[PDB]
Amino acid sequence: TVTDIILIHGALNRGACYDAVVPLLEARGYRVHAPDLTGHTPGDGGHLSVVDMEHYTRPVADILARAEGQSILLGHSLGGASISWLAQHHPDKVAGLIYLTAVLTAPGVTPETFVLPGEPNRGTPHALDLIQPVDEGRGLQADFSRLERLREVFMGDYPGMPPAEHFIQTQSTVPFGTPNPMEGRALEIPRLYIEALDDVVLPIAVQRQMQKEFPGPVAVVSLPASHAPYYSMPERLAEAIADFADAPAEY
């Protein structure tokens, strides 16, 4: 019933951040996709090209259109804003949702709620510190004056640093501001949160607060990783993802 698995990158990243994981999930028998979202492919126009969420997430909807059967959507970090948007518009094609230390927001809630300071257990101040606005506020871009700080905060799971194909220079602020449209049929999709216990970008406190605030049950697996478990434990990550695709309703 589930033939496809679609891994979606977070902010300032590209599809290829998942290179360690894609072969591991194809061995489990799945067709695996890790597409660039709109604006995340050098030469496509970058952040200002992204009109809205439908536009941003189109490469995934394109994939889901041609999937033989049902698909699993994994979002990482800000990627969860996309998988929740897609769920609501393609609930007929999605069989499972994986939030990998990802933004899980209740219907009608924007990811801004948990990135900005607030109560209870709201805020991602390491990220806000190292990620900076550009283009009169319509782009985010990392603070390259503090490269070692950038590495220990965002890429410390990598054994060694990652390749240039994993990243873009400027991020659209569109996904940060769009509320979760999930309603009715889409709230029945099984949900799985994969916690990253040692993340300092998205602290475990904020991870758990978003789980507690989403309406309805959310399954949980925990990993002893920081912000990028697809770097430091691709095998354990793949295993969790595939055991969930094998039976999302049960798991």
Side-chain angles (χ1 to χ4, degrees), residues 9 14 24 45 48 69 73 92 102 115 142-143 177 202 216:
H9 60 72
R14 299 178 66 200
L24 299 187
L48 283 183
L73 308 184
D92 61 310
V115 161
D143 182 18
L202 185 54

mmCIF file of all heavy atoms in Angstrom, residues 9 14 24 45 48 69 73 92 102 115 142-143 177 202 216:
data_model
loop_
_atom_site.group_PDB
_atom_site.id
_atom_site.type_symbol
_atom_site.label_atom_id
_atom_site.label_comp_id
_atom_site.label_asym_id
_atom_site.label_seq_id
_atom_site.Cartn_x
_atom_site.Cartn_y
_atom_site.Cartn_z
ATOM 1 N N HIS A 9 13.771 18.457 3.263
ATOM 2 C CA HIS A 9 14.791 19.191 3.986
ATOM 3 C C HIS A 9 14.183 20.358 4.786
ATOM 4 O O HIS A 9 13.068 20.814 4.537
ATOM 5 C CB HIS A 9 15.831 19.730 3.007
ATOM 6 C CG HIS A 9 15.255 20.667 1.988
ATOM 7 N ND1 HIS A 9 14.838 21.945 2.302
ATOM 8 C CD2 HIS A 9 14.986 20.496 0.670
ATOM 9 C CE1 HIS A 9 14.352 22.523 1.217
ATOM 10 N NE2 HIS A 9 14.428 21.664 0.214
ATOM 11 N N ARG A 14 19.168 21.390 1.334
ATOM 12 C CA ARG A 14 18.673 20.817 0.090
ATOM 13 C C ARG A 14 18.456 19.314 0.275
ATOM 14 O O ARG A 14 18.992 18.703 1.204
ATOM 15 C CB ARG A 14 19.630 21.086 -1.095
ATOM 16 C CG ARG A 14 19.867 22.570 -1.422
ATOM 17 C CD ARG A 14 20.875 22.755 -2.594
ATOM 18 N NE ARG A 14 20.332 22.231 -3.838
ATOM 19 C CZ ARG A 14 21.054 21.896 -4.906
ATOM 20 N NH1 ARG A 14 22.372 22.034 -4.906
ATOM 21 N NH2 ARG A 14 20.449 21.406 -5.980
ATOM 22 N N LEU A 24 19.634 3.486 2.424
ATOM 23 C CA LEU A 24 19.212 2.592 3.500
ATOM 24 C C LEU A 24 17.726 2.263 3.408
ATOM 25 O O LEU A 24 17.325 1.118 3.666
ATOM 26 C CB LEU A 24 19.567 3.212 4.848
ATOM 27 C CG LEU A 24 21.070 3.425 5.011
ATOM 28 C CD1 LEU A 24 21.398 3.886 6.410
ATOM 29 C CD2 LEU A 24 21.800 2.140 4.681
ATOM 30 N N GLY A 45 16.115 30.793 -8.830
ATOM 31 C CA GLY A 45 15.618 32.086 -8.411
ATOM 32 C C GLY A 45 15.746 32.352 -6.935
ATOM 33 O O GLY A 45 15.640 33.515 -6.522
ATOM 34 N N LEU A 48 13.205 34.709 -3.307
ATOM 35 C CA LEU A 48 12.151 35.606 -3.780
ATOM 36 C C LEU A 48 11.216 34.948 -4.787
ATOM 37 O O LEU A 48 10.132 35.483 -5.057
ATOM 38 C CB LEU A 48 12.749 36.877 -4.390
ATOM 39 C CG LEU A 48 13.297 37.978 -3.474
ATOM 40 C CD1 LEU A 48 13.784 39.178 -4.307
ATOM 41 C CD2 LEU A 48 12.289 38.443 -2.408
ATOM 42 N N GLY A 69 1.519 3.923 -5.393
ATOM 43 C CA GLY A 69 0.642 3.751 -4.248
ATOM 44 C C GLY A 69 0.690 4.931 -3.288
ATOM 45 O O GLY A 69 0.670 6.086 -3.727
ATOM 46 N N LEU A 73 5.541 11.021 4.242
ATOM 47 C CA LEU A 73 6.195 12.325 4.192
ATOM 48 C C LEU A 73 6.954 12.524 5.489
ATOM 49 O O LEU A 73 6.371 12.433 6.584
ATOM 50 C CB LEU A 73 5.182 13.445 3.965
ATOM 51 C CG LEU A 73 4.220 13.299 2.777
ATOM 52 C CD1 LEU A 73 3.341 14.541 2.622
ATOM 53 C CD2 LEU A 73 4.986 12.968 1.468
ATOM 54 N N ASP A 92 -5.385 11.997 0.242
ATOM 55 C CA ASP A 92 -5.680 10.800 -0.527
ATOM 56 C C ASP A 92 -4.422 10.092 -0.988
ATOM 57 O O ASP A 92 -4.514 8.945 -1.448
ATOM 58 C CB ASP A 92 -6.535 11.155 -1.751
ATOM 59 C CG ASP A 92 -5.832 12.131 -2.700
ATOM 60 O OD1 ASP A 92 -5.328 13.182 -2.235
ATOM 61 O OD2 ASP A 92 -5.771 11.838 -3.924
ATOM 62 N N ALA A 102 11.102 18.403 14.046
ATOM 63 C CA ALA A 102 10.474 19.235 13.042
ATOM 64 C C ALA A 102 9.380 20.064 13.691
ATOM 65 O O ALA A 102 8.919 19.767 14.792
ATOM 66 C CB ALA A 102 9.889 18.383 11.908
ATOM 67 N N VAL A 115 9.274 29.266 17.226
ATOM 68 C CA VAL A 115 10.615 29.798 16.972
ATOM 69 C C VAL A 115 10.876 31.037 17.831
ATOM 70 O O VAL A 115 11.942 31.177 18.443
ATOM 71 C CB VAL A 115 10.771 30.094 15.465
ATOM 72 C CG1 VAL A 115 11.940 31.059 15.178
ATOM 73 C CG2 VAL A 115 10.918 28.788 14.662
ATOM 74 N N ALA A 142 22.445 32.622 6.885
ATOM 75 C CA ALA A 142 23.242 32.357 8.075
ATOM 76 C C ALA A 142 24.309 33.423 8.306
ATOM 77 O O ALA A 142 24.749 34.131 7.387
ATOM 78 C CB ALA A 142 23.911 30.980 7.989
ATOM 79 N N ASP A 143 24.757 33.511 9.557
ATOM 80 C CA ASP A 143 25.783 34.484 9.937
ATOM 81 C C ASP A 143 27.154 33.873 9.701
ATOM 82 O O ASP A 143 27.744 33.242 10.584
ATOM 83 C CB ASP A 143 25.617 34.912 11.383
ATOM 84 C CG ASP A 143 26.628 35.934 11.796
ATOM 85 O OD1 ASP A 143 27.247 36.579 10.899
ATOM 86 O OD2 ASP A 143 26.787 36.121 13.028
ATOM 87 N N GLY A 177 5.540 31.502 8.123
ATOM 88 C CA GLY A 177 4.431 32.370 8.434
ATOM 89 C C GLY A 177 3.077 31.815 8.086
ATOM 90 O O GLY A 177 2.060 32.426 8.421
ATOM 91 N N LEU A 202 16.558 23.203 17.969
ATOM 92 C CA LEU A 202 15.201 22.955 18.427
ATOM 93 C C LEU A 202 15.294 22.152 19.725
ATOM 94 O O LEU A 202 15.384 20.913 19.692
ATOM 95 C CB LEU A 202 14.413 22.201 17.356
ATOM 96 C CG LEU A 202 12.944 21.996 17.666
ATOM 97 C CD1 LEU A 202 12.308 23.348 17.978
ATOM 98 C CD2 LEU A 202 12.280 21.311 16.485
ATOM 99 N N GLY A 216 -4.877 15.440 19.255
ATOM 100 C CA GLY A 216 -4.858 14.049 18.873
ATOM 101 C C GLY A 216 -3.521 13.390 19.150
ATOM 102 O O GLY A 216 -2.531 14.049 19.502
#
